[PDB]
Amino acid sequence: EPREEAGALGPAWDESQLRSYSFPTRPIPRLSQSDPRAEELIENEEPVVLTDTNLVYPALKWDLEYLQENIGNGDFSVYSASTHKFLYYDEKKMANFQNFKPRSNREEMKFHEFVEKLQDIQQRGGEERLYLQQTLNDTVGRKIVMDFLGFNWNWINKQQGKRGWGQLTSNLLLIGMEGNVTPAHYDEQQNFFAQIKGYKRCILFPPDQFECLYPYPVHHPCDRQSQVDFDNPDYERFPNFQNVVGYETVVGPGDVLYIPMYWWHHIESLLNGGITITVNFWYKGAPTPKRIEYPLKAHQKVAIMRNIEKMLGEALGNPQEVGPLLNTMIKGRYN
Amino acid sequence: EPREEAGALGPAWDESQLRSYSFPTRPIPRLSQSDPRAEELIENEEPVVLTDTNLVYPALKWDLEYLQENIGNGDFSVYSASTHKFLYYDEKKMANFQNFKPRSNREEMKFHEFVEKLQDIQQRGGEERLYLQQTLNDTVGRKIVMDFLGFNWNWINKQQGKRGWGQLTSNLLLIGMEGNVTPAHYDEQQNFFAQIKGYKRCILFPPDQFECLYPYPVHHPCDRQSQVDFDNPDYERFPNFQNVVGYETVVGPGDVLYIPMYWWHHIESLLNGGITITVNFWYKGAPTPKRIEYPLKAHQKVAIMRNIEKMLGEALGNPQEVGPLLNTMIKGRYN
Ligand SMILES: CCC[C@@H](CC(=O)O)C(=O)C(=O)O
Ligand SMILES: CCC[C@@H](CC(=O)O)C(=O)C(=O)O
Ligand SMILES: [Zn+2]
Ligand SMILES: [Zn+2]
């Protein structure tokens, strides 16, 4: 249920701001960084919302006005779409599938241009949607650098060490409009998802629900994204989606959600909730141990399936032939 | 159609001695060793019956009496079955499938014991069937050694050189009863199949008919054998068997059939034709070239599929899990 803001300022959100879907869920635990149960969840690669890390405490003051003045004059990737769904697609893989035409259009612009184009839309009441997704880099201004350095690196660096993870891969700056949705997908890296402004509903599915969520082929641009339209699921093509069960939570300013590697997640900025701001923290996972302990974990089987698809594309000399060969291998032999 | 024996001795066989099957066929070419078309077929890895190689000319005099006196006192593998079908099974793989109970029973016996047990069956009119399949080795007697040395090694050694094949792997001595059948299967080595006594109907299918013949899993004992009962094909499980087209021939004494590597073959000793004797010649194929030329040949795709199944069994730690994972990879993603 919804949490209550301090100072009797009422519920920060209410259930009417959540989109409706076909599957059940149960809540992700919301715990203190000092709670041993929170450490055991992260250790066991299960999601947990940490409420008091102060991970991005300096960034809680961030809003569009502050950022525009201080984030510098670098280029920012801004996506546009006529729908609320911002399906991610790999442009490098767009050669393998010349019949894929994305629904989101990426435009590279300056931050003040992003703010203005957002102002125009709001002014003219248009229905176009924007999502700014840009990796933080050197080009940011001095005050953002100061904020960045003020993150709680003491806490997250200990997490990185305790879990044996690799190095910090990148921080993504995410600024979306109310109602924006990132469809279900999984990432190959560990993720601390640090909410700054507004509220995001996060729905996670463990890696052992691969069978229910039907990722695209590895060579398709939407590799790692679910083929299922959560708003109109085709149960004839995706029958096991009827068995999908999620882990759900709403993160607000100051919350950090641990999204373990290979865990599916569906992320939506609450309806009529204003703009949302997030910074994520992506780390390479721990190295695979020399002695493989059976039985394998679900995410290890996912990794095997990915490797098979990759190698089959290399060996055949064309990713389009992967499907036919795989069918030939199984029809009447393993099904 | 049937060939006519020299000396006006009538047709060596007639169509009534062939079992009836559901698929069409067209004849394998019967050519002279000196015919350039025969060399081009072997070069292109297509089957051909060579009528005049003299490959096993010294062995044409072989019969049971001669062999019993001279083949020595080594052990011979003799298979028994209540059916005409002698389905091959790998005993080393019988651990992976503890629910597989073979229909053929292997007994290790002396050659005179093989002749006697065959005599008893004939005497009592029993319906039990035997198939002697034993690799020729050092234990054979002096007269068999003389015959073996008299094979046409000049011709076959040139074939081995011209085609870049590996070394001779083994010679199999095959002695079966009339009506005996070796069900459809493919071998990973090149094969010159040298008929000595009696007649065998050989039905071959190219490697690109993998989809129609439904081999067992690689880890099953019947790896490389077809799952289709040629006498009662289950078209619900094996629908593409209705599209199978074979290459057919009957080999007699003095014929040599080139069975290219990975080509399916179904071999049956003609009905009411007496005992059959064959010696085959298995060679490792040429090495795979460093630069892979696309498009791939059919047998290369078969090799890829085999390797995937093998690696998936190693990686998962259990061959029984290969099927489930492969299904998970494809359901709703590549089909
Ligand atoms: C562009 C990726 C951002 C994010 C989802 C979101 O907040 O809309 C996500 O999927 C992740 O941090 O892994
Ligand atoms: C045991 C294998 C013998 C042979 C078939 C047969 O003559 O019954 C075959 O399949 C081959 O030479 O490859
Ligand atoms: Zn993600
Ligand atoms: Zn064979």
What are the φ/ψ torsions at residue B277 (nearest 5 degrees)?
-130, 130
Contacts of B269 (CB under 8 A, 6+ apart): B176, B177, B178, B179, B180, B181, B198, B199, B200, B275, B276
Measured at the CA of B32, the angle between CA B28 and CA B34, to 5 degrees, comes to 130
Are B217 and A334 within 8 A, CB to CB?
yes
Domain boundary among B291, B307, B324: B291
**B45 to chain A nearest CA, in Å?**
21
Spatial distance between the Cα atoms of B149 and B147, rounded to a whole number of angstroms: 5
Q: Is the Cβ atom of A195 under 6 angstroms away from ligand 1?
A: no
Q: Count how many Cα atoms sit within 13 Å of the Cα of residue A90 in the half-sphere of its side chain.
A: 16
Length of chain A in residues, anyone? 335
Name residue B197's beta-bridge partners.
B277
Shared-domain flag, residues A276 and A182 = yes
Report how far apart, in Å, the C-alpha atoms of B276 and of each of A52, A196, B199 are: 85, 84, 6
Spatial distance between the Cα atoms of B145 and B137, rounded to a whole number of angstroms: 10
Which residue in B200, B167, B178 sits closest to B278, CA to CA? B200
Spatial distance between the Cα atoms of B41 and A214, rounded to a whole number of angstroms: 46
Helices (H), B56-98: 64-70
**C-beta separation of A200 from A245 below 8 A:** no
B303 neighbourhood in chain A, CB within 8 Å: none
Contacts of A74 (CB under 8 A, 6+ apart): A110, A111, A137, A139, A140
Show which of residues 171-230 on chain B sit within 8 Å of chain A, judged by CB atoms.
210-211, 214-217, 227
Shared-domain flag, residues A287 and A323 = no
DSSP state of B323: H
Measured at the CA of A203, the angle between CA A277 and CA A131, to 5 degrees, comes to 30
Shared-domain flag, residues A158 and A123 = yes
Q: Is the Cβ atom of A188 under 6 angstroms away from ligand 1?
A: no
* Cα end-to-end distance, chain A, whole Å: 44
Assign B171 to helix, strand or coil. Answer: coil
Spatial distance between the Cα atoms of B135 and B168, rounded to a whole number of angstroms: 12
Spatial distance between the Cα atoms of A263 and A208, rounded to a whole number of angstroms: 9
Spatial distance between the Cα atoms of B178 and B271, rounded to a whole number of angstroms: 5
Helix axes B36-43, B153-162, angle to 10 degrees: 50
Shared-domain flag, residues A311 and A276 = no
What are the φ/ψ torsions at residue A158 (nearest 5 degrees)?
-70, -40
Please report the DSSP string for A45-92 in residue order: T--EEES---TTGGGGG--HHHHHHHS-S--EEEEEESSSB-----SG
Domain that holds residue B334: 292-335
Report how far apart, in Å, the C-alpha atoms of A230 and of each of A85, A88, A126, A250, A292 are: 10, 15, 25, 18, 36
**B284 to chain A nearest CA, in Å?**
22
Name residue A317's beta-bridge partners.
none
| Minimal Cβ distance to B308: which of A308, A317, A333 | A308
**B264 to chain A nearest CA, in Å?**
16
Per-residue tokens: B64 = 């049971």
Name residue A130's beta-bridge partners.
A80
Query: What's the CA-to-centroid distance between B182 and ligand 2, angstroms?
Result: 7
Contacts of A87 (CB under 8 A, 6+ apart): A102, A103, A104, A183, A222, A225
Shared-domain flag, residues A275 and A324 = no
Shared-domain flag, residues A209 and A331 = no
Shared-domain flag, residues B160 and B202 = yes
What string of H, E and C letters represents the secondary structure of A233-289?
Answer: CCCCCCHHHHHCCEEEEEECCCCEEEECCCCEEEEEECCCCCCEEEEEEEECCCCCC
B304 neighbourhood in chain A, CB within 8 Å: 312, 315-316, 325
| Nearest ligand 1 atom to alpha carbon A131 | 8
Report the 10 Å Cβ neighbour count for B105.
10
Name residue A281's beta-bridge partners.
A171, A192
Shared-domain flag, residues B162 and B187 = yes
- Tell me the technique behind this structure: X-ray
Assign B226 to helix, strand or coil. Answer: strand
Assign B278 to helix, strand or coil. Answer: strand
B295 neighbourhood in chain A, CB within 8 Å: 317
Which residue in B315, B226, B269 sits closest to B18, CA to CA? B269
Per-residue tokens: A62 = 């961030």
Spatial distance between the Cα atoms of A282 and A136, rounded to a whole number of angstroms: 12
Spatial distance between the Cα atoms of A150 and B130, rounded to a whole number of angstroms: 84
Spatial distance between the Cα atoms of A158 and B34, rounded to a whole number of angstroms: 79
Contacts of B275 (CB under 8 A, 6+ apart): B64, B175, B176, B177, B178, B197, B198, B269
- Comparing alpha-carbon positions, the chain B residue that sits nearest to A323 is B334
Contacts of B21 (CB under 8 A, 6+ apart): B203, B230, B231
Pick from B229, B244, B334 the residue to mutate for testing the A interface (most A CBs within 10 Å).
Answer: B334
Q: Is the Cβ atom of A59 under 6 angstroms away from ligand 1?
A: no
Which residue in B115, B106, B111 sits closest to B137, CA to CA? B111
**C-beta separation of B302 from B220 below 8 A:** no
Q: Are strands A48-50 and A30-31 parallel, antiparallel or unpaired?
A: parallel
**C-beta separation of A302 from A262 below 8 A:** yes
Q: Is the Cβ atom of A193 under 6 angstroms away from ligand 1?
A: yes
Shared-domain flag, residues B129 and B171 = yes
Domain count, chain B: 2
Which residue in B242, B55, B79, B74 sits closest to B152, CA to CA? B55
**Is the dihedral angle over the CA atoms B303, B306, B310, B316 positive or is it negative?**
positive
Per-residue tokens: A5 = 């803001």
What are the φ/ψ torsions at residue B79 (nearest 5 degrees)?
-100, 140
Shared-domain flag, residues A188 and A328 = no
Shared-domain flag, residues B272 and B331 = no
What are the DSSP E strand ranges found in A61-206? Answer: 76-81, 105-109, 129-135, 168-176, 181-185, 190-197, 200-205
A315 neighbourhood in chain B, CB within 8 Å: 304
Spatial distance between the Cα atoms of B105 and B87, rounded to a whole number of angstroms: 10
Shared-domain flag, residues B271 and B307 = no
Spatial distance between the Cα atoms of A193 and A280, rounded to a whole number of angstroms: 4
